Design a protein around this motif. Structure first.
Motif, PDB file in Angstrom:
ATOM      1  N   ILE C  10       0.828  -1.202   0.000  1.00  0.00           N
ATOM      2  CA  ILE C  10       0.000   0.000   0.000  1.00  0.00           C
ATOM      3  C   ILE C  10       0.865   1.256   0.000  1.00  0.00           C
ATOM      4  O   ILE C  10       0.521   2.251  -0.645  1.00  0.00           O
ATOM      5  N   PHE C  11       2.002   1.239   0.704  1.00  0.00           N
ATOM      6  CA  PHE C  11       2.879   2.408   0.707  1.00  0.00           C
ATOM      7  C   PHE C  11       3.472   2.649  -0.680  1.00  0.00           C
ATOM      8  O   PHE C  11       3.522   3.792  -1.165  1.00  0.00           O
ATOM      9  N   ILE C  12       3.913   1.577  -1.341  1.00  0.00           N
ATOM     10  CA  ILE C  12       4.455   1.699  -2.691  1.00  0.00           C
ATOM     11  C   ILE C  12       3.384   2.205  -3.648  1.00  0.00           C
ATOM     12  O   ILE C  12       3.653   3.039  -4.519  1.00  0.00           O
ATOM     13  N   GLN C  13       2.149   1.716  -3.499  1.00  0.00           N
ATOM     14  CA  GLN C  13       1.070   2.175  -4.367  1.00  0.00           C
ATOM     15  C   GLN C  13       0.714   3.636  -4.110  1.00  0.00           C
ATOM     16  O   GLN C  13       0.382   4.366  -5.051  1.00  0.00           O
ATOM     17  N   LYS C  14       0.769   4.080  -2.851  1.00  0.00           N
ATOM     18  CA  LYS C  14       0.552   5.495  -2.566  1.00  0.00           C
ATOM     19  C   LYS C  14       1.622   6.364  -3.210  1.00  0.00           C
ATOM     20  O   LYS C  14       1.310   7.435  -3.744  1.00  0.00           O
ATOM     21  N   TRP C  15       2.885   5.931  -3.170  1.00  0.00           N
ATOM     22  CA  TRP C  15       3.930   6.676  -3.871  1.00  0.00           C
ATOM     23  C   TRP C  15       3.687   6.664  -5.379  1.00  0.00           C
ATOM     24  O   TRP C  15       3.879   7.681  -6.065  1.00  0.00           O
ATOM     25  N   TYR C  16       3.251   5.515  -5.906  1.00  0.00           N
ATOM     26  CA  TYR C  16       2.953   5.381  -7.327  1.00  0.00           C
ATOM     27  C   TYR C  16       1.858   6.345  -7.759  1.00  0.00           C
ATOM     28  O   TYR C  16       1.907   6.886  -8.869  1.00  0.00           O
TER      29      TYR C  16
ATOM     30  N   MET D 145      13.038   9.943  -0.455  1.00  0.00           N
ATOM     31  CA  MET D 145      12.333  10.039  -1.729  1.00  0.00           C
ATOM     32  C   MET D 145      10.922   9.473  -1.634  1.00  0.00           C
ATOM     33  O   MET D 145      10.029   9.917  -2.367  1.00  0.00           O
ATOM     34  N   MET D 146      10.696   8.500  -0.748  1.00  0.00           N
ATOM     35  CA  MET D 146       9.352   7.959  -0.583  1.00  0.00           C
ATOM     36  C   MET D 146       8.459   8.922   0.189  1.00  0.00           C
ATOM     37  O   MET D 146       7.282   9.093  -0.152  1.00  0.00           O
ATOM     38  N   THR D 147       8.996   9.562   1.231  1.00  0.00           N
ATOM     39  CA  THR D 147       8.190  10.477   2.033  1.00  0.00           C
ATOM     40  C   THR D 147       8.079  11.857   1.397  1.00  0.00           C
ATOM     41  O   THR D 147       7.242  12.662   1.820  1.00  0.00           O
ATOM     42  N   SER D 148       8.898  12.150   0.389  1.00  0.00           N
ATOM     43  CA  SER D 148       8.838  13.437  -0.283  1.00  0.00           C
ATOM     44  C   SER D 148       7.819  13.393  -1.420  1.00  0.00           C
ATOM     45  O   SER D 148       7.137  12.389  -1.643  1.00  0.00           O
ATOM     46  N   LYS D 149       7.714  14.512  -2.139  1.00  0.00           N
ATOM     47  CA  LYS D 149       6.823  14.666  -3.293  1.00  0.00           C
ATOM     48  C   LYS D 149       5.343  14.553  -2.911  1.00  0.00           C
ATOM     49  O   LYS D 149       4.975  14.045  -1.852  1.00  0.00           O
TER      50      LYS D 149
END
Ligand SMILES: [Ca+2]
Ligand SMILES: [Ca+2]
Ligand SMILES: [Ca+2]
Ligand SMILES: [Ca+2]
Ligand SMILES: [Ca+2]
Ligand SMILES: [Ca+2]
Ligand SMILES: [Ca+2]
Ligand SMILES: [Ca+2]
Ligand SMILES: [Ca+2]
Ligand SMILES: [Ca+2]
Ligand SMILES: [Ca+2]
Ligand SMILES: [Ca+2]
Ligand SMILES: [Fe+3]
Ligand SMILES: [Fe+3]
Ligand SMILES: [Zn+2]
Ligand SMILES: [Zn+2]
Lengths: 587, 149, 587, 149
Positions: C10-16, D145-149
């Motif tokens: 879910i975290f990877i999909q939120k970044w996606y 990079m994951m927590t940014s943007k």
């Protein structure tokens, strides 16, 4: 109760112990030597005048170009010789919120005189506490006139018995920087032997432009700001770099570094560096990096807890020195500790490097209301710091009062005289009534002096001491009733406080031999040293052809000791010379 | 019992004990606490001291030696200790109860506590303690002047 | 597993989701308009040349005085027209740790040219992203050449499609401040339409003396330091005060105050204030406090969380402004947000005042190693900040490489052409083999152009486009095999990257009408506005006697729209003019 | 059960639930979790998913609806939640296990996760994520990079 009463009692007693430990030592610093020297002055004259016969030979032996300002100048006449009344007049003039601008000619005169007097001073001013037995050190002010007034009210006006030390940063970040600078220069001129000024990092034209001091000067004096700044430039150029207390404590503004040496500093020409950040290079030669680095380090350095020395990144100027650097500096220069000021503290003071470094700050509310408190250091003859905290207010500044206070040294000599004169009080009153059969209480100066001289043969210049032994006396007759009250009530004697009679006591004993003793006291240790005596003899016998024989110096050096402990106190030396001169003029 | 303390604190606690134990017999008597109360200007007498010397004794006898003194003060320092002693000292210093120690109360304390200070010395001490310029020593200034020097 | 896999997914999909939301919008900013305008250029010419007959009338219409230095100067010739090769030469010269001193005459030439070019610029430089569709903003550098090199390596060299914005503080607190300043001036001279420089608080002679920049200049150039500083003074005087992005975002160094007004700032004469802290007052007149206060506030202000405006006590200069002051400023000036730089941040960026204030810092290790990171802002056509963090190193600075990168606008026009030309690839190859019976793969320029023009009648200047549609072609024959590969493999077309063929595409469409569109785009909104068209007509009909009739302007304004949505894009306007001129020259 | 959460977090948690519940019937099936695992490039299959869909269900049936999903994630967020998901994401991103996410693994992820990025785009993303200039994304840079943007 249980816990409360016992804990409160023990805490109060612990505070009492320190209070007594301070008080008894403070009184012992004077009384035990003063009683012995007074006994010497009153009795040993008999042994002294026997050898006086053999020791007769050597023991007695440009211009104004200002312009008128607008309608905001107040009348306050200032003359070349600065005295106390000028100080009070300047204090009253600057204290007013509206209409506090004095004439430009007086400002120019004060600045010119201050620059001329500071030109003759050396790079490092030596300070000794032999006479005062105390010294006061103040931190940064930054134009806070209220803090300076609070300090002056709390500790009293500067005097020979109450010296003052200022560690720079008198201007910038303040609405009354010019007034503070003028007041400091006026105090220094009025009391050259009691006021010491050290140069800080903010005493710079570049710093003034950065913090807007030149804008403040322009606003205060729109017509003559350029001339005032030009005069202030000379004062900035001629400010001393620092001071040393009894050859043990060094007072600097910023600090030092690993390569900082006092020998190089004592040889630096202060005239060349009008501005530290931007040297003028008027002489037409490249800047000497080695000489400028010493001044830059002693002006911009700050201490750090971490070991080693690194450049000061936060300020961008100076270096950070750790405890090892401080220890090496103290070892190399044989110093005890160092007092500095530069960084602001919440309490106005802070101990660093296991108490080898002391930081003092005197400007309260430096950043905001209640941000920090101001403080100053009181040091005794043994150089133990004592910190007094204060907070300045604008409303209370008009209710303050200033006085020159009462000297510590004088507080013992008069008290011992009053105590020991009680044995002849009845005979003194009887002889007064013999010269005054009506018991009116007033007899002439000559009659009074002769009466008390006959009652107690001492031969002292009683006419000068009349101002001390008879307050309120007239030029024709002396009120001996108050003189008897001094023997009957010590309160009347103690209630003299500040007065004009101080010079009468300063005439006796305290001649220029006071400075002579400090000159011959090389190590600044108490009651001189026999090694100092022989060292002085070894060059005073052959320094000039008019010098006396060594055997003559040895006899006089042995004679300067009165109590026989092998050492000669400053007051002991003064009393010996006074007795010798008195017998010479009376025989 | 005394293991909780170290020699550094015992160095001052022995002086604190000897403050009461003036006769040197090794144990605090009732008269020894009474003379300390009188020196501090305190009212309590036998009616309170007799119960005190047994309640703060923790042993069961009418005198207090060094271990017994150390025991109760150790129980005190293990708990919160700082505020209460300071508040009691300020209260006994502040006779009038107005919250500001004036020159008269300080002079009365010093002459009762053992000094013979003149008016000028008391005024100098007041002006040194008066940080804020009010003219009277409040609680904060009293704490600062007590913890300083 | 259990929690781990599901939470990671879910975290990877939120970044996606955010990644896609950015990417699709970035590609949609170009492709959907570019396809329509290419269809217009290829087909609507037929409808255009019908009305071309009626619209023929108006639609087509001092000196060198330096001295030789010591034996440390390296040879690097620099000429008046600055180009890319000069930029690479300067980068290579400054990058060397030893022997990085160029001749004083080149430094003087660069400084003189920079001052002369900056003299003509207005107080506030307007910046538009119509062509570039992106913009880069950089914070304080303080002489950190490594940070500038890292930024240039990461984001590429400045260009018309990659504009750069610098917010002052190029000097002081750095060992290579002079090199950074020279590189920035060289980049500005080489790319006047892509480099914008804003003046900071550290760009001051007083600031240079305070932080020792003049000492660095003297150490670098012991003989000609005075002349170099004098030339730098003019550059400091002529530096622009700030820039505005699309009339929505204001970029300033320090900030603003409650009385700060952009209208007053746009009228301030920059020439008078060579130095901000210490104005010269050369004209012989008293300083205008009101005019100087605006510059002082915009240079020295800092934001605060507390409401209200108070003077900046910590810095001693400027004022603190709260969220209410920022809201009032934005309301009065009709702005969206403000980008500033002045205070250092651990991450190099910080949001303040519910994201109405953005602070950017680009100097890494400002106080110590690892103290803070450097960052820069990337903004798209919709002005959404994107922060990239970096840390500079001395060892890796020699391995960096710099390129001008590939434009976003060009990345769509070539791709759509390649995609839509695939339908005739077989016929193109057949005609090539007809003109090249041996299938050698090389035919002359005229033969190739005629062949593909006959296969696909477009009439474009194919000779200029030869550099794009046939890489590696010779001056005699064109390799049509690579042209066919472009239709068969998009990889060959995309692998062009940076190249000299960009000017060939810039000749077509992108004439000075690009700047004309920005001039007529008053509100800076996308694809112009009909209100802007009528407003322009209302003064273009009667501004000069040579003006055309209003009915002529109306027809051409209606014709500039190609897709019929009622609005005219910049590229739509360029394509319409290009088609009109092409038909005029071909008929 | 769901009282511990608020609408602000539920706004993102409903999207998180619909990430698995793609068919829209209102409850996660086994195939729905399997296709998410395949999209993320994960190995587990029926032998693990059958037990998972009942163990993280807390109800006792072979499917997961919105309340059941919310329940377990609520039990998770009440406890410590931040570190473990990030470590698992870094581990699945770091196929080689060397602790540095190179261009090849990132490209494999993006093409498996759903993108068709070219080499230049992956290089640009790597150079933007590479804060320290090493050339590979470590744990700190990955988190940033994951927590940014
Ligand atoms: Ca001595
Ligand atoms: Ca002696
Ligand atoms: Ca006893
Ligand atoms: Ca007992
Ligand atoms: Ca009271
Ligand atoms: Ca008070
Ligand atoms: Ca528009
Ligand atoms: Ca359109
Ligand atoms: Ca389902
Ligand atoms: Ca279920
Ligand atoms: Ca990897
Ligand atoms: Ca890395
Ligand atoms: Fe200071
Ligand atoms: Fe800066
Ligand atoms: Zn200072
Ligand atoms: Zn700045």
């Amino acid at each position: 109760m249980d816990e409360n009463a016992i804990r409160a009692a023990i805490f109060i007693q612990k505070w009492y112990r320190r209070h007594q430990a301070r008080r008894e030592m403070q009184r012992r610093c004077n009384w035990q030597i003063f009683q012995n020297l007074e006994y010497a002055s009153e009795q040993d004259q008999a042994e002294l005048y026997k050898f006086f016969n053999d020791l007769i030979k050597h023991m007695p032996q440009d211009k104004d170009d200002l312009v008128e300002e607008f309608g905001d100048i107040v009348n306050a006449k200032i003359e070349l010789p600065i005295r106390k009344n000028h100080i009070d007049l300047l204090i009253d003039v600057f204290r007013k919120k509206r209409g506090n601008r004095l004439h430009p000619k007086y400002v120019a005169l004060i600045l010119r005189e201050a620059a001329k007097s500071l030109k003759q001073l050396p790079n490092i001013s030596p300070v000794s506490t032999a006479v005062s037995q105390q010294v006061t050190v103040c931190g940064d002010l930054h134009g806070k006139l209220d803090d300076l007034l609070v300090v002056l009210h709390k500790n009293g006006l500067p005097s020979s018995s109450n010296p003052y030390v200022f560690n720079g940063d008198f201007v910038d970040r303040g609405k009354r920087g010019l007034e503070v600078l003028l007041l400091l220069l006026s105090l220094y001129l009025a009391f050259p032997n009691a006021v010491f000024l050290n140069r800080g990092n903010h005493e710079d034209s570049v710093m003034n432009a950065r913090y807007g001091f030149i804008r403040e000067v322009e606003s205060k004096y729109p017509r003559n700001h350029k001339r005032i700044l030009a005069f202030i430039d000379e004062v900035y150029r001629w400010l001393p770099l620092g001071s040393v207390l009894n050859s043990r404590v060094l007072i600097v503004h910023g600090g030092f570094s690993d390569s900082t040496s006092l020998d190089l500093i004592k040889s630096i020409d202060r005239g060349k560096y009008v501005s530290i950040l931007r040297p003028p290079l008027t002489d037409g030669e490249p800047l000497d990096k080695t000489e400028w680095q010493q001044i830059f380090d002693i002006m911009w350095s700050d201490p750090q807890a971490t070991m080693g020395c690194v450049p000061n990144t936060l300020r961008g100027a100076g270096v950070w020195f750790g405890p090892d650097v401080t220890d090496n500096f103290l070892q190399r220069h044989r110093l005890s500790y160092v007092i500095r000021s530069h960084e602001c503290k919440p309490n106005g003071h802070e101990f660093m490097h296991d108490n080898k470094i002391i930081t003092i700050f005197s400007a309260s509310n430096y950043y905001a209301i209640g941000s920090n408190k101001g403080a100053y250091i009181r040091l005794n003859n043994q150089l133990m710091p004592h910190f007094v905290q204060y907070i300045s207010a604008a409303s209370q500044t008009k209710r303050l009062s200033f006085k020159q206070r009462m000297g510590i040294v004088e507080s013992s000599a008069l008290k011992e005289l009053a105590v020991r004169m009680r044995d002849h009080r009845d005979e003194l009153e009887d002889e007064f009534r013999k010269y005054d059969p009506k018991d009116s209480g007033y007899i002439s100066i000559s009659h009074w002096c002769k009466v008390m001289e006959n009652v107690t043969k001492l031969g002292l210049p009683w006419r000068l001491l009349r101002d001390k032994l008879a307050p309120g006396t007239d030029s024709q007759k002396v009120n001996y009733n108050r003189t008897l009250d001094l023997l009957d009530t010590d309160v009347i004697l103690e209630a003299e406080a500040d007065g004009m009679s101080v010079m009468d006591a300063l005439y006796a004993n305290k001649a220029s031999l006071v400075a002579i003793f400090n000159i011959i006291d090389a190590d600044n240790s108490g009651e001189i040293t026999l090694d100092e005596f022989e060292t002085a003899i070894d060059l005073l016998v052959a320094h000039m052809p008019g010098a006396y024989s060594k055997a003559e110096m040895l006899e006089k050096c042995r004679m300067m000791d009165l109590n026989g402990d092998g050492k000669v106190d400053l007051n002991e030396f003064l009393e010996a010379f006074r007795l010798s001169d008195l017998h010479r003029k009376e025989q | 019992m005394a293991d909780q303390l170290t020699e550094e604190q015992i160095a001052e606690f022995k002086e604190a004990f000897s403050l009461f134990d003036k006769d040197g017999d090794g144990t605090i008597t009732t008269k020894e606490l009474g003379t300390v109360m009188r020196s501090l200007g305190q009212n309590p007498t036998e009616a309170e001291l007799q119960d005190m010397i047994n309640e703060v004794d923790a042993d069961g006898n009418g005198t207090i030696d060094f271990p017994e003194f150390l025991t109760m003060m150790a129980r005190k320092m293990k708990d919160t200790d700082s505020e209460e002693e300071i508040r009691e000292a300020f209260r006994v210093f502040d006779k009038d109860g107005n919250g500001f120690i004036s020159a008269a109360e300080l002079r009365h304390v010093m002459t009762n506590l053992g000094e013979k200070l003149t008016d000028e010395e008391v005024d100098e001490m007041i002006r040194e303690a008066d940080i804020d310029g009010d003219g009277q020593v409040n609680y904060e200034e009293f704490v600062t002047m007590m913890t300083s020097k």
